[PDB]
Design a protein around this ligand. Structure first.
Ligand code: NAD
Ligand code: NAD
Lengths: 310, 310, 310, 309
């Protein structure tokens, strides 16, 4: 099986590396206008393979994507000095204008996995451009936020992260909604479990955890300018779910007909992920307060998309 | 890094195999009355390791349990077609009067993991004979029924069982309690999930799932004489939780001071499992109907234990 | 991807279990005339899945094999009292005469992986009956003996087995050929490695290791009546090589136009294994003595095939 | 078990990533002078772990190396485009005079795994500074070159590199020695295998593979600025071998009393790697041309090191 990655910067290359070391696919192809860059990463990654799993890793053009079951779009351009957010958006939206049709020409059955920030808008862009059914185009969304939510809650409760089933919904960013109400730990509603552990989730404890999720990427950016290792592994896990027809639930971004009363918007909800992309979308049980917050997040996103021309 | 298994029969050897396939422990010692059988199982599994994970599997005497962090008790008779697990109690209680002290003498710090049926009462028997702290003696309990419930719902919904959150409490047997009330997929109550998936779960569908879980062992025993693959993997998973001090949350059996008004009885509840056995116990809020079912189940077990003086 | 297993005895079910715990394939289908037997193994293994990887395991008919990329043939019939082993072969050959065309009817592009003993002759039978090209029908052959040879050499040299590259060729059985001459350890010719290690291999060392390989199965049989764990994982590994298009080398059995002067015989040689089955057959460097032994092994298999009518 | 990484730049961080992805160790600590860098990397990798294996990755001081079974040394400058590894020598030797004592102060029983270039000389430097037995100081050596050789052969032959047995000895650098003479696939000498597969390796083909291996780092550095993915995984593998007492055989660098007639030089040969480092060294028979080249390699390293030394 073959996976494509368009954009061979730190995010695309870290994804390719995680795919290789975890042996997710037999073939991994990197595409980037900076040909020498994609080649250099493909070569560096190929050289890791004898220490792990056999993977044909190479750099090529869109034609090399033929047969790809998933293609990761990590093709965000580098922000110029004093360019501002909205300008960057346009440039990136225009890159996608060139990338999407050329990917789908070579790999007409590919699931598209958008990584480019802001993921929700870019997922909307990719969806619109693709002309594909809504489930075929997915963005990394809140996948890392959700994992981080579980990790912090797990530390708080003194249990394994794998036992904590909690979600982050909506925008990958400031308006993300931590869903406390219907969270569970090893089958136990979170409230009953916290009590069993001598923990009352005070509003101040939850506030602590909330900020911990929201601010996570901040220290990484501050310390080295960009994050890629975390997201690389997250994308590799999503690719695995697609390629293996897993039908496991992930919080990823996708075009959504209606959510919390807002219409036609791309954002994160728990979704069943398999061979054709999203196999079905789940709408979690929310408290009135969480619903209001999701509504606000969707409104923020809808408006940001509309403003771009989408 | 060392685990012991007492009883290298179908259940004991499948456990060793799963441990090896899942790369759980560096050392697995098989202790059987029949040394040749255990040695054969050990060599057979050893020949599997080149195709999985490096593991030293070998056959020894009880003394060879020295240093084991966990010891699985899988010795004793299994139920035949017309028999319930409770009807094995007197035969297997005599066996544990021999097994338990021999394990305690060779490996006094080992967490005991009980597989022998009826697993709940045999857990009680092991706890009583061991003289160990309550949390250090754990029975597999409903870990297998929970997996069955999740797998059957997975088949029904076409969602991977990792994302199907439902469990079984009480007796590993005819009086077990399926906890429909809190069952959940992607943060949505199970029945609402199935509804939205156009796969609504009618009372007849639920009755069918229930029989599928409750009579699983009986069907398998009818078809092939014994069950062992499912429990094998479950035991390997619990062994991993102990070895890694995972603090994962599982529905396993252990001595319970009070549950649903019944005193001093071993049965399954959601518990935190780690390096010293049970680290904590949860008493979930059940539906009124489930709560009453759990009471009858605890009452059944307390009665059976009491008849032998446990 | 989908894998089928025809024959749900201990070998078939152990293979399915290894496939499931290792997450080699998304779908595993067990097919056996004894429908209740297959169903019982399929349920038992399905219940293991929530502890490891999502796999749809079920029991079905040949029709259910549609789209399977590999099908494991472990369909051997049970010996009757007084029945000769030759008479047993006859009955197994008749079984294969039914199994092979029904499998291929449902999964025309499937690689057939023969597990039934004697594996070389049954590989020959499957190949003749299939009507496929020789690379499409592979038998487990000496996969376990090769691994065993490496383990014993590794033990002798005090090195990791993964660093030992040596092969057992020919018949899976008494006429097996250990290739000492061209074996290497970490890139170094075996004799130089041992010499450097200050452990030159004497005739006595080679004889002991030879017996260690050549009687390994007998020892397991004598203790528990049949082997299945080892070959289950071995078969699972070969299935994985096929499904991932690994192009790795394995000593597996396949029809061979000419080897050591003998014509048209199935026996084990190091073969490149991937999507279509064997992608190439390697003929290792042999000493006169090794070549003489291989010729004899080939002659023995050729005579047995001919005797059976193949 | 715990592993430490000193130098949390591209190599150190990629090593941590590979360790996390392969589930090699339960605990990985990153140490750097730039604490914010190490912290950013550790948190970035920590966020990957939910999608791979439970691993506690964090950034700490030298003191925090305590209990580490192995410490990877990846601190120091890397080569700029068009720069040789030997040109890093004076600068990185100065780095190691600070690094090495500090590591052994916190973790006296750790096997040292040297990545910093030029690896062979740096391995020699670490050995001299350490006071440890020669086997406890191991350089990644030609482990990467060997992998490159196998990978390029894999692409040529269409065979998984696991099944291509070829290696590189000597300097991790321009004088390295590709050992064509004993390369094998499935027990068949490489050239005979290739011929029988319908793809004979001509002299021109072999020369291209040589350039492919020998100059791989210069190309990658021209194209993206640094190499790190290849060595990251190779270091994770070597760390796994140490932690697990694997006794796997790898072409790694270590102090060598005599090789090809040259005395007291650190360079790569096939060695057994386990707990406590190098368990033994093999001196394979080489073609006359390979042995002369290995000799040259040893002489070059010894002379380059002589400057202190
Ligand atoms: N979910 C569950 O907990 C679960 C599931 C399946 C089976 N089981 C149970 O596990 C038990 C074992 O079933 P089995 O199929 O493996 O039986 P086997 O296949 O008959 O295994 C029993 C082995 O224990 C050995 N043995 C007996 N007494 C011993 C002693 N004092 N010391 C050492 N070894 C001893 C025997 O020699 C025998 O090999 C049964 O009680 C069965 O009901 C439990
Ligand atoms: N096969 C190989 O052996 C191989 C392959 C690739 C790179 N390398 C080498 O590895 C080294 C690291 O490369 P890099 O790309 O990561 O460089 P970076 O990306 O420049 O990494 C270097 C880090 O070392 C840190 N450092 C310096 N002195 C320190 C000290 N006293 N204590 C703690 N940290 C200190 C620096 O702060 C810096 O973050 C280079 O020498 C490079 O040539 C070797």
């Amino acid at each position: 099986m073959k996976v494509g990655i368009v954009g061979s910067g730190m995010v695309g290359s870290a994804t390719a590396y995680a795919l290789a070391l975890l042996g997710v696919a037999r073939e991994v192809v990197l595409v980037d206008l900076d040909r020498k860059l994609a080649q250099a990463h493909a070569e560096d990654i190929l050289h890791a393979t004898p220490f792990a799993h056999p993977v044909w890793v190479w750099a090529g053009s869109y034609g090399d994507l033929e047969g790809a079951r998933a293609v990761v779009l990590a093709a965000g351009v580098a922000q110029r000095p004093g360019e501002t957010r909205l300008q960057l958006l346009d440039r990136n939206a225009q890159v996608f204008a060139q990338v999407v049709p050329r990917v789908l020409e070579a790999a007409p059955e590919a699931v598209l996995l958008v990584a480019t920030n802001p993921v929700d808008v870019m997922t909307q862009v990719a969806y619109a451009l693709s002309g594909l059914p809504p489930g075929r185009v997915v963005g990394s969304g809140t996948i890392l936020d959700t994992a981080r939510f579980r990790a912090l809650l797990a530390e708080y409760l003194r249990v394994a992260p794998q036992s904590v089933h909690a979600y982050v919904l909506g925008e990958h960013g400031d308006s993300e909604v931590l869903v406390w109400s219907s969270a569970q730990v090893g089958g136990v509603p979170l409230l009953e479990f916290a009590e069993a552990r001598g923990r009352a989730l005070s509003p101040e404890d939850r506030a602590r955890i909330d900020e911990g999720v929201r601010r996570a990427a901040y220290r990484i950016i501050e310390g080295k300018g960009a994050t890629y290792y975390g997201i690389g592994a997250g994308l590799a896990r999503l690719v695995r779910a697609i390629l293996t027809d897993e039908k496991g639930v992930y919080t990823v971004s996708a075009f959504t007909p209606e959510v919390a009363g807002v219409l036609e918007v791309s954002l994160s909800l728990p979704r069943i992920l398999g061979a054709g992309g999203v196999a079905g979308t789940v709408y979690p049980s929310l408290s009135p307060e969480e619903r209001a917050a999701l509504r606000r997040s969707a409104e923020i996103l809808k408006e940001a998309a509309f403003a771009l021309g989408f």
